């Protein structure tokens, strides 16, 4: 139950290929033109 | 209701010649026994213990004492094997299922009429 050997830099960088953050679901707000998250209330204006 | 197609396809199997009763009523159910080479009738007599979901799937249970040995028969309510059910006498209970009669014998299992 211990690592029998090192994980080389190649293996490391390989495993984390799919480890990333997604760009937010952002759309432009119709009253102010600033971006907002879709289905949420704009925090700059306060609309829909 | 239940699903409409379930209720439609099984409406013809429902019996209507049957009376209305409730748990606690003591009654006489008659049954076509096709034993031997004859369709005889055995008048089964008991106390209704419970009954379940509607449709062809309603089933009721009746309890009696044969030789000091409790016997209970569950019957589908709409079984065509029952000729008739007579509520021989009514019964004042306060449950919908009467499981608590499996531990009593004699006057302890008493029921008031109406």
């Amino acid at each position: 139950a211990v690592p029998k050997r090192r994980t080389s830099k190649t293996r490391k960088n390989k495993r984390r290929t799919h480890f990333k953050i997604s760009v937010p679901g952002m759309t432009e707000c119709p009253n102010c033109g600033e971006y907002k998250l879709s289905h949420r209330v704009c925090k700059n204006c306060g609309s829909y | 209701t239940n699903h409409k197609l379930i209720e439609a396809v099984t409406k013809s199997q429902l019996r209507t010649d049957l009376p209305s009763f409730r748990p606690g009523d003591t009654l006489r159910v008659h049954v076509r026994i096709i034993e031997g080479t004859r369709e005889r009738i055995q008048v089964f007599e008991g106390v209704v213990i419970k009954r379940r979901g509607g449709g062809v799937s309603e089933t009721f249970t009746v309890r009696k004492i044969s030789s000091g040995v409790g016997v209970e028969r569950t019957f589908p309510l709409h079984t065509p094997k029952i000729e008739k059910i007579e509520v021989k006498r009514r019964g004042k209970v306060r449950r919908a299922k009467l499981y608590y009669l499996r531990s009593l014998r004699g006057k302890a299992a008493r029921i008031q009429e109406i």
Binding site: - | L5, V9, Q13, G55, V56, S57
Partner: protein
Amino acid sequence: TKGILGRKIGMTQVFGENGELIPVTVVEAKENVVLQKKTVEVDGYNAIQVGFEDKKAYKKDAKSNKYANKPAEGHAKKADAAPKRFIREFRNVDVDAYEVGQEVSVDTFVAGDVIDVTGVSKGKGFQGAIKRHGQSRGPMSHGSHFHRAPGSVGMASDASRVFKGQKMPGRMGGNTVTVQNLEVVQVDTENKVILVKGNVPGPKKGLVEIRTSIK
């Protein structure tokens, strides 16, 4: 010989001629339409494709499988039919007794046939070795620490490996299963329902492929 696409509605019971309780499943087969007639020289094997249910027609900006897409509208309009939801095909049938565009009706089945119902099982999700594989689990007392896990997965130095097919935890369900030698108790032509003795695979609101026993 016969085949119909349907979906499972539930189970009930019917009483038989001699009083017997018959356990039954209600299946709803409606507007089954033939959409093609596969042929040996055109496709290499003779069979017919049946579409079941009814989707809505194409609309611009559809966001769900409720409405047909342009690709499917075309396939169904070549059989002058409405877009359908489930499409399967049958090989046991005689391709020449069917025409591209006919309705397959519940009455194809008479009372007392022998049919095979092929559906998909209900999903149980990720499960362990005792529910998924029927394994006896270990002692629950006498100082045991082996309650439900699977036992040895192999031997020792000989086969210093786990062999393929070792029955271990994972997803259960989502498998095509064919129950065989069921029969139909009644066919109702107005509500469009084929009643089949016994029970069939799948969740309620599923899909079953009834055809004639191959045995």
